[PDB]
Ligand binder design. Structure first.
Ligand code: HBT
Ligand code: MG
Ligand code: ZN
Length: 351
């Protein structure tokens, strides 16, 4: 029923109401999902692009764009609990908001805007619901093909890009050859940066950026060159990928249930195979609450606190919500040694 929102629906009134919060951190993608015949990704990407006049700027037809997004959305596994199209929509919509932050006003080109939103949308496509390390230890075709390096993240790129070639799917058809090679380079860089094994190198570099930042007379970050811009961008996308815990508790509890169920599903495959069970993946032993606090203290808060620095005072509410959600889980509970599970799970790579 009628694609002005690019999707079928029987509650355009409630879909519209919900898309009023398109530009806000508080948008509810679960609701957009429920009012779009579970096409949250197609729906939110279609809204974001009209909102940013991106289809105009890059001469992308509504049909080309809906045809591609639909296909991209088809390539997220609906039987995977967390890494399905709801996640991709969320990260896309979250990048859209981060891009609007006042400290970054007019800092990026339209091409960079396009790349960052596209990267967010494709960053987990065709995710099988198991980790890089799982794929490597079981000798998956994907691990062989990509030499055990950012295996899934290489696959998300191949797939997202491959789908441009489907009939009526080339949303970049009208870019210049130069724009296209620049977009490809930036998206590759951003999607590779969503590999959690890089989290600590990302974060160290973001801290250096923070410590020597410059802001204009207005109050807006001064980003000297390409190198500085793509670095903010790769951090922005990693932040969006890690934004679940900074969202209202109503939303984060749902994201938590989902990733826990996907972790448990990997653990069962590990148990079934006689493998050691990855951290947080053993349903018989996991403790969500304890894990929440550790994950927020060791991974999420250190990052968002640095992003909040970069763009101060813009991200203060984000940081506040994050601290409230942490204390919510903490209250249910009756340091390096303690962080060891996260280190094992994320496999931080030295550089
Ligand atoms: C106790 C739970 C709470 C939520 C959570 C985790 S781990 C986690 N996220 C990740 O592990 C993650 C983050 C960035 C990129 C990839 C992943 N991942 O592969 O799961 C979340 C979350 N909702 O983002 C542990
Ligand atoms: Mg990923
Ligand atoms: Zn993701």
């Amino acid at each position: 029923s009628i694609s002005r929102f690019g999707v079928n629906t029987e509650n355009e009134d409630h879909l519209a109401k919900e898309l009023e919060d398109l530009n806000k951190w508080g948008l509810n993608i679960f609701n957009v999902a429920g009012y779009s015949h579970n096409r949250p990704l197609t729906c939110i990407m279609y809204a974001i692009f009209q909102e940013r006049d991106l289809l105009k700027t890059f001469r992308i037809s509504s049909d080309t764009f809906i045809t591609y997004m639909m296909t991209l959305e088809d390539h997220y596994h609906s039987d995977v609990a967390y890494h399905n199209s709801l996640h991709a929509a969320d990260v896309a919509q979250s990048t859209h908001v981060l891009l609007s932050t006042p400290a970054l006003d007019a800092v990026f080109t339209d091409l960079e805007i396009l790349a960052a939103i596209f990267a967010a949308a494709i960053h987990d496509v065709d995710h099988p619901g198991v980790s890089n390390q799982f794929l490597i230890n079981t000798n998956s075709e994907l691990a062989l093909m990509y030499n055990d390096e950012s295996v899934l993240e290489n696959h998300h790129l191949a797939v997202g890009f491959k789908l441009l070639q489907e009939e009526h799917c080339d949303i970049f058809m009208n870019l210049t050859k130069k724009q296209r090679q620049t977009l490809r380079k930036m998206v590759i860089d951003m999607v590779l940066a969503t590999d959690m094994s890089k989290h600590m190198s990302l974060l160290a570099d973001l801290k250096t950026m923070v410590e020597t930042k410059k802001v204009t007379s207005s109050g807006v970050l001064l980003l000297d060159n390409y190198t500085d811009r793509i670095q903010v961008l790769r951090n922005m996308v990693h932040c969006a990928d890690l934004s679940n815990p900074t969202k209202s508790l109503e939303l984060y509890r749902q994201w938590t249930d989902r990733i826990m169920e996907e972790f448990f599903q990997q653990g069962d495959k590990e148990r079934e195979r006689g493998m050691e069970i990855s951290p947080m993946c053993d349903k018989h032993t996991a403790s969500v609450e304890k894990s929440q606090v550790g994950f927020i203290d060791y991974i999420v808060h250190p990052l968002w606190e640095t992003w909040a620095d970069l763009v101060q005072p813009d991200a203060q509410d984000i940081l506040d919500t994050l601290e409230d959600n942490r204390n919510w889980y903490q209250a249910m509970i009756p340091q390096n040694r303690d962080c060891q599970g996260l280190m094992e799970k994320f496999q931080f790579e030295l550089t």
